[PDB]
Amino acid sequence: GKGRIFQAAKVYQRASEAAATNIVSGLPPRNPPLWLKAIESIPPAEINTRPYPIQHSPPNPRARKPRNLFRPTKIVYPEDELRRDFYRDHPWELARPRMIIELDGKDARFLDWSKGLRQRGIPLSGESVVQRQLWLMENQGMTKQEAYDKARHEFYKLRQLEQMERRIAVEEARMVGGYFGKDLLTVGMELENKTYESWKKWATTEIARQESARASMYTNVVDN
Amino acid sequence: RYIPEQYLRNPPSDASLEDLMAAQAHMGHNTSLWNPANARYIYGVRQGIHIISLETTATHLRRAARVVEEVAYRGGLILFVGTRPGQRPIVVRAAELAKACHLFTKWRPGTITNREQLLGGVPLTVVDELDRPLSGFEDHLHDRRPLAPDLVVCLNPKENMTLLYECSLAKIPTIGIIDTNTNPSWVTYQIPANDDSLRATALISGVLGRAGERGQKRRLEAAQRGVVTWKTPADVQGYFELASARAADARRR
Amino acid sequence: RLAELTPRDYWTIEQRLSVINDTIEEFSTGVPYDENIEIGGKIRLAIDRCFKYDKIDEIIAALKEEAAEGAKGGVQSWAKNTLEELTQRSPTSLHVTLRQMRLGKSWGIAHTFKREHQMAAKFMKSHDFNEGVTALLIDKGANGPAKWKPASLDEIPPGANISEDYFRNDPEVPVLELLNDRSYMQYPYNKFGLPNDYDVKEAIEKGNFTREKLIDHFVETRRGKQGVREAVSDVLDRMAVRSKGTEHVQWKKE
Amino acid sequence: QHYLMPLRDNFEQEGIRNFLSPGSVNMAYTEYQTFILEKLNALVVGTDFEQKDTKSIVLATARDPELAHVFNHASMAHNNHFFFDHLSPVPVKMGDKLFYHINENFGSVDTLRDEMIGTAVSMFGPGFVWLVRTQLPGQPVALRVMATYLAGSPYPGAHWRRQEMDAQTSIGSSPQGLSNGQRFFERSAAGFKGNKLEPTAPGGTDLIPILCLNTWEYAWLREYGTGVGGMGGKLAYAQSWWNMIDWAKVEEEARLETRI
Amino acid sequence: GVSPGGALLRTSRMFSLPPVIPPPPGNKLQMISERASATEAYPTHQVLTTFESSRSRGDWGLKRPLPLKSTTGTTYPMVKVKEMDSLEQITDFTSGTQHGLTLKKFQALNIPISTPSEIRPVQRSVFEADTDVTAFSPDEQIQEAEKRWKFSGPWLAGMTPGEFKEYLAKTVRPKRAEFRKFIQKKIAAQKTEAANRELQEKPESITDDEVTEYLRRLRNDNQVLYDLVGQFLDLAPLKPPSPYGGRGPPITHPSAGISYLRTAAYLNNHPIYGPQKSHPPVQARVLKPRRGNDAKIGVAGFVADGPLGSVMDKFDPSIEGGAKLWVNVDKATVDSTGRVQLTVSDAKATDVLIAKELIGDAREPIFGSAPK
Amino acid sequence: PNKPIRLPPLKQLRVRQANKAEENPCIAVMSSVLACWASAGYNSAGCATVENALRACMDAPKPAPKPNNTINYHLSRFQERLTQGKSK
RNA sequence: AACAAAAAGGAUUAGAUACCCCAGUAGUCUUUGCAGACAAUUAUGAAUGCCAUAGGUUAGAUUUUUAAUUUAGUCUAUAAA
RNA sequence: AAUAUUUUUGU
Ligand SMILES: [K+]
Ligand SMILES: [K+]
Ligand SMILES: [K+]
Ligand SMILES: [Mg+2]
Ligand SMILES: [Mg+2]
Ligand SMILES: [Mg+2]
Ligand SMILES: [Mg+2]
Ligand SMILES: [Mg+2]
Ligand SMILES: [Mg+2]
Ligand SMILES: [Mg+2]
Ligand SMILES: [Mg+2]
């Protein structure tokens, strides 16, 4: 028994009895702690009582002696199957960074998926395609594939314009005397040079080191 | 609609489900590392972790705020304890609002059960209804034994169990943030939430900090009307009786 | 949670209701963010301007003015919908209904049941009840809509006072014997809901709060109950005049 | 999300009496600015610039060759409002200090009047004409005129997109062409390599744009029309603009040192 | 029926994380390294970002705040979370720039992705209503199956002998009953042909005799049979008697969601010189020289074959930073396994010198000084 | 093949010798000298160049001790997390 | 064949039947019987019902066969006890 | 890495 008897839930019951009477028989009990009356009407909650957890999926009806009746179940939605299909068809869509840090939690209040892929507050990513697909598939009664094609093609027409802006925006700026810094292609190559040079130092050092091992195999200390 | 240092400059009076979710107050620990005792606050399982119910976190948080408020309304000494690398600004800010004590380092074992030795030379002071000091208790502040918090608010109960045990051993109420892997029987009022997140702790501390502030306001506002919400503690009460006894001798003699 | 609460035997009923009031407010997930007060502002003002008379003839007359295009109330759509429903109910019940709304403001809780029993006892003999129920529940709307004994309120002449026989207890029907003698004129504990005009009035008449400083006074006393900021603001948008500016606020009735 | 903000003195509902009818100011700011913000919001919908200010985006996305398109909207939404804000409801008398200082840098108010107006028409393109405040570490507060193209930032921190000279009709084989060409290459090479061409004080205090003039097509193409036959047009637009300059605010934003 | 707390989680941002897709397919019967793994062909985890104000605190919207040592200092904040909370009670993460910037490099080349071509270059876009389609109906015959790219059945020539056995026994064998019905629907249509044609100038078809006999007539012509079996299982055509099925269909979208451009038929207008002939060159590394019967070069993070022609002949330790040569990316496509193969073609001389003019590396500037 | 097991609860997760044990270099030169004498001879000339190297080794100053390895400290931080726990 | 109680020799040792060594018969193995004692051990009889988790592992099953559920065993570390 | 001489007693 490595545990200890924690009586944190009975601090009131214990303190209420110790303050009811006085140790010195024949005198009135002294004033109780200042906290005894503050939580007089705020009892603790019931702890350590395993309930039947919420079932997020229909439990196996064929099981006659089911186990894990007090185990929280996995939360699975209809979108999980769509996210896996999309991101697998567009693996490099994961390279596009996406922030999962919420600002105030009120993001699903301005999302009306009957308008289109572009919504307020969230970026155009594989989720917008999934939420748009789920809407058409349910409301418009489209099949998984039909809704997928429609919502998928709207995603491309919006991404194409994004890549065209970067090219034209730069070309347009130089036509009026606008210069920029080092592009990502150049910066990436310079970093490889600094690393390749460090590898060259490691190669020449080990190569020379192996020569000693090859010469140390045979013995020539006599100097014939 | 979100600034990192917003829970300190202006914490909210009450936390909604949107605030708690945005602050990652529902991210439990890995399913493998769980305490089945606190399977009552878990909503499900996702990303390999347990998801704490956003409704259970709000109902327990609103209850603790009512506890921190009343204890401050009755002139109680509160203690906000958060001992983690970045939990110092949070605890100190909460204490300022609630006019309480802070603790952001390792709790020295025995500061409650062995307070006579540890808190020996620390100075005290006697204040009246309106928190203004009283003169004449010089001889009482030399024999009086050190104080103990009337309510502890731990932001990481899993780390410091020596503090929570001294509270249960000394009959002191406690409030803690019970993560999925924390034993819920260590405190009196649990707050199921993610204690590993620095953004969820600042929100809880702000709510509890504002609760104390709102409690101290009522207490002091009632004192101006000649309505004291508390009576002299037993320790100071005994000193009064001895004072009259010594004063009686002067009257006769 | 209500089961975990174990009050002391020496606690007054006021303490018991306060402990349960604070326990219910802990499970509040917040009112909707988009839904606005339905009966508030314009529609709420129209209700007070068209239902203050003691005769249904005047009430409908007032509504006709609101429904008339060009009125300043702005409830043309609502007033029109209200009339379409008032001309589809038994004209006898309307007279009797409005009659007791003015009398019920002085009856006691126990006196109400005794009067309602003698009142509901005479409705069983009436022709409208036995007709409306059969024509709407048993027949399920079949055979057309209900056919009240008086075709419409227009048939009832102004001098008619049909709302006078349903308030005369007969000796045949024994007086209702209640299980106890407890009674009261006003509810003893009915101030746990949102603050209505009565509460806002009491605060204004006992303080020097401003437009914005008065709303905060309620968010504190009510421990930030959900919907207090939206309810108090509405009351201060119908019966609150900015007479002295942002310094203070007064009521419109004066 | 970035949202539109009301104008200075209710120009949206009423508009300047003798400069821009309410219908023109409606299409110039309430409709166009809304269009730019709708595009800007979609670009920074999920980036760090979701809560940053237009100026903060202008300086942050000035040199980035991959965020040039984000700079245009951010720089356009800023310069557009910077122009309408300075407009006054009624004519304002030029301040003594400002009037006296202008004569020291341009000789007379009429000289600066025809310079900015002339520079606008001589550009034959959309952009902005600025009245900059040049103050070096030791030199006095000297003013000058700078003409930016479609979306150019007069701030020193955004020198990467100043866009002063057109590279189509300013770089050729003539003596002036070669000189301009060398500068175009000297800047690009230096900017790319990171070298600083002209030293600048920290905090971007060298240049402080005081006044602006939006010469884009949408601003005046409706009020003053094309301008065939000299009646109206871009020229009249610039001239009429000279009568609604809030010289009081222009003087305040100048912050001229006490030298009188 | 879902509680309000459960409704916010469904729409939360952390719940939107996509599951970890399987890694890029490799050779099943081969050897690999276990104690060390390099960058993958395409990303498998989602790359995350955070506000610069939240990065100074380590807050990335995860279980716990990340350390500031390996998370701050870099320009582009990117990270991949393999496990939000491992058995060590720590968020197992790693820098995501390996794939986050590789996408930005490729998108900086401004080249689309076109369907593979067998060896008259015809660069057809990938996103088109005729080819880029996944939904279909039982009316489309084989002539339309060549356009599709997402099939439900596997590629037979690719599956291993064991993977093929599992398919025949557990996916094909328990379908005879349903397939016999598929034939009946066809036979029902054939009988309607003669009736319709004769009327201008359907029968239920539920009869085991016709179905069983209809299959005996196709034994002599096994070709027409395969077309019927593939339509029931949605198999990728293999024999020409066509849709570039020599190597098999793609395991993903033909573009892999890396570049959504459709055409490269444009001319970047240079400020001074004007419209150029070809696209600007890109400097490429030299890896694994010939002296392997082929040389590898690193073009924007990707590895591709060198141009069909020094730097490619022999290794030169003296060259600082390694051998680097300018080159033009001609064509880019995604093979069956998902790799991004580039058809790197040698670049011209004038283009390189022109690209350096805006950089300051050109020895002699082409403008002004150039006399001829 | 199975994967590495989860170690049982230990008293302390550490390595006996954190920093490698340095071997005296001159001991290796002596072995080469003893090799010449075995094959060539003692009062010979082939061991001249090898005997000189042995004298130069003992004359040279020994290296300085390397900074201790901090492996055992980090092992103690992740013990309870990596293993089943701490036992005592 | 090999190993090896016994018997026998050589050493060690204050003495050495011994431990070590040179050799070595029963016996070990095959077939047919007798014999029934074992730390024949999990120092824990067999069996039924029931009690919260985690990390490995064995033979299967199912599946959105990637990786998670699941039946019957076995083994470590724990909770309540 | 596969190393191994002996060494009793204490009212
Ligand atoms: K032997
Ligand atoms: K036997
Ligand atoms: K097991
Ligand atoms: Mg924790
Ligand atoms: Mg012997
Ligand atoms: Mg045997
Ligand atoms: Mg045995
Ligand atoms: Mg037995
Ligand atoms: Mg076994
Ligand atoms: Mg065990
Ligand atoms: Mg002895």
Side-chain angles (χ1 to χ4, degrees), chain A residues 75 77-80 83-103 105 107-108 111 121-123 127 131 134 138 143-146 148-149 152-153 155-157 159-160 163-164 166-167 171 174-175 184-186 188-189 192-194 196-197 199-200, chain E residues 6 10-13 15-18 21-22 41-51 54 59-62 78 99-104 107-110 127 132-135 149-150 252-253 256-262 266 268-269 271 283 285 300 302 315 317 319-322 324:
Chain A
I75 309 175
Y77 302 118
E79 308 106 79
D80 300 348
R83 291 194 192 89
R84 186 160 55 86
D85 292 1
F86 177 88
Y87 282 99
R88 279 188 180 178
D89 296 2
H90 308 68
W92 281 97
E93 197 68 35
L94 300 166
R96 291 194 63 82
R98 190 152 68 79
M99 310 169 70
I100 60 170
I101 164 162
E102 319 217 36
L103 313 190
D107 293 318
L111 299 183
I122 54 171
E127 186 65 11
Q131 301 293 341
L134 197 74
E138 290 184 346
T143 63
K144 175 169 175 176
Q145 308 298 345
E146 284 184 349
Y148 182 47
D149 281 358
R152 176 162 50 79
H153 284 300
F155 183 66
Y156 300 152
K157 295 172 182 174
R159 284 295 194 197
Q160 186 180 10
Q163 302 191 238
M164 292 182 66
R166 301 202 196 90
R167 184 176 56 76
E171 183 179 356
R174 278 158 177 164
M175 291 282 291
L184 189 59
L185 276 164
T186 302
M189 185 59 65
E192 299 186 13
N193 301 331
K194 309 201 187 74
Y196 174 86
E197 287 181 357
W199 165 91
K200 192 180 289 181
Chain E
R10 183 173 174 175
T11 63
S12 56
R13 293 190 178 188
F15 276 43
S16 302
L17 271 173
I21 57 170
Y42 57 73
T44 45
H45 304 272
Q46 179 60 61
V47 176
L48 308 171
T49 44
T50 191
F51 301 95
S54 279
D59 178 49
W60 292 67
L62 305 167
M78 295 168 181
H99 282 100
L101 297 179
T102 304
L103 170 61
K104 288 182 176 175
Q107 286 189 344
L109 304 173
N110 300 317
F127 320 92
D132 184 17
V133 168
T134 57
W149 63 271
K150 184 181 181 182
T252 165
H253 196 265
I258 191 175
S259 174
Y260 296 92
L261 286 167
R262 286 173 178 172
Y266 60 84
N268 51 323
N269 191 16
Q283 201 166 14
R285 272 211 166 284
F302 296 83
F315 185 90
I319 295 172
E320 53 78 20
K324 301 179 292 190

Side-chain angles (χ1 to χ4, degrees), chain A residues 3-195:
Chain A
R4 300 178 185 180
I5 294 161
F6 266 80
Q7 309 181 29
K10 295 187 174 185
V11 298
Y12 178 82
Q13 182 182 349
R14 298 157 55 202
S16 184
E17 298 165 5
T21 54
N22 202 323
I23 306 179
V24 181
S25 315
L27 296 182
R30 311 205 170 288
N31 305 135
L34 301 176
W35 62 264
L36 198 68
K37 185 161 189 170
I39 62 176
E40 189 192 18
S41 56
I42 312 175
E46 180 172 339
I47 53 160
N48 304 337
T49 297
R50 303 291 297 283
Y52 190 51
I54 298 165
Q55 304 296 308
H56 300 291
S57 158
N60 190 12
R62 316 180 70 193
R64 302 170 74 84
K65 187 173 182 182
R67 305 181 186 186
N68 302 341
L69 291 177
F70 311 97
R71 177 174 300 280
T73 54
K74 295 189 177 61
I75 309 175
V76 289
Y77 302 118
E79 308 106 79
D80 300 348
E81 193 66 11
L82 313 183
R83 291 194 192 89
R84 186 160 55 86
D85 292 1
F86 177 88
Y87 282 99
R88 279 188 180 178
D89 296 2
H90 308 68
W92 281 97
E93 197 68 35
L94 300 166
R96 291 194 63 82
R98 190 152 68 79
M99 310 169 70
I100 60 170
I101 164 162
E102 319 217 36
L103 313 190
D104 55 357
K106 310 177 187 178
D107 293 318
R109 295 189 177 181
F110 319 95
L111 299 183
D112 186 0
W113 291 114
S114 68
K115 307 305 192 182
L117 285 172
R118 316 221 86 173
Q119 295 296 344
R120 172 180 170 186
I122 54 171
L124 182 68
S125 60
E127 186 65 11
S128 56
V129 177
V130 164
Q131 301 293 341
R132 177 61 173 182
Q133 174 176 357
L134 197 74
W135 190 88
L136 304 163
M137 174 159 54
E138 290 184 346
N139 289 29
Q140 289 193 353
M142 286 185 172
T143 63
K144 175 169 175 176
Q145 308 298 345
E146 284 184 349
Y148 182 47
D149 281 358
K150 184 171 181 178
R152 176 162 50 79
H153 284 300
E154 300 172 2
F155 183 66
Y156 300 152
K157 295 172 182 174
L158 294 177
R159 284 295 194 197
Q160 186 180 10
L161 300 172
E162 285 183 45
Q163 302 191 238
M164 292 182 66
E165 282 179 2
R166 301 202 196 90
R167 184 176 56 76
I168 296 164
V170 173
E171 183 179 356
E172 181 169 276
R174 278 158 177 164
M175 291 282 291
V176 290
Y179 47 97
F180 302 85
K182 296 196 183 180
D183 56 357
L184 189 59
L185 276 164
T186 302
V187 173
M189 185 59 65
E190 294 186 358
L191 292 168
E192 299 186 13
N193 301 331
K194 309 201 187 74
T195 308

Side-chain angles (χ1 to χ4, degrees), chain D residues 45-52 64 66 167-168 171-173 177-182 184-185 188-190 192-193, chain E residues 13 49-54 76 104-105 108 269-274 354 356-361 365 367-369:
Chain D
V45 59
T47 64
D48 186 288
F49 307 115
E50 188 186 5
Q51 288 184 134
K52 263 60 182 182
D64 211 7
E66 310 196 353
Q168 175 59 14
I171 304 174
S173 310
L178 302 177
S179 71
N180 290 11
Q182 296 293 352
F184 180 87
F185 284 109
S188 304
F192 193 98
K193 294 179 182 181
Chain E
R13 293 190 178 188
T49 44
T50 191
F51 301 95
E52 295 302 284
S53 66
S54 279
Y76 293 102
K104 288 182 176 175
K105 291 178 180 175
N269 191 16
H270 190 277
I272 300 161
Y273 311 141
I354 288 160
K356 293 181 178 180
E357 263 282 11
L358 301 166
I359 313 302
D361 292 288
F367 181 88
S369 72

Side-chain angles (χ1 to χ4, degrees), chain E residues 348-368:
Chain E
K348 307 299 184 181
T350 55
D351 289 357
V352 174
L353 279 293
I354 288 160
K356 293 181 178 180
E357 263 282 11
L358 301 166
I359 313 302
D361 292 288
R363 193 66 162 181
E364 281 186 30
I366 303 168
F367 181 88

Side-chain angles (χ1 to χ4, degrees), chain C residues 211-251:
Chain C
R211 158 61 187 196
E212 180 56 277
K213 194 54 51 173
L214 175 53
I215 299 165
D216 265 9
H217 162 77
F218 282 106
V219 179
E220 307 155 69
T221 53
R222 305 313 310 273
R223 281 193 49 69
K225 175 189 264 279
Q226 293 287 358
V228 167
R229 190 170 197 79
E230 308 187 5
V232 174
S233 54
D234 185 13
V235 176
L236 301 178
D237 293 1
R238 309 194 319 276
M239 302 185 177
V241 58
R242 182 194 175 90
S243 64
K244 189 160 61 143
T246 177
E247 298 86 300
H248 292 81
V249 177
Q250 299 177 350
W251 262 42

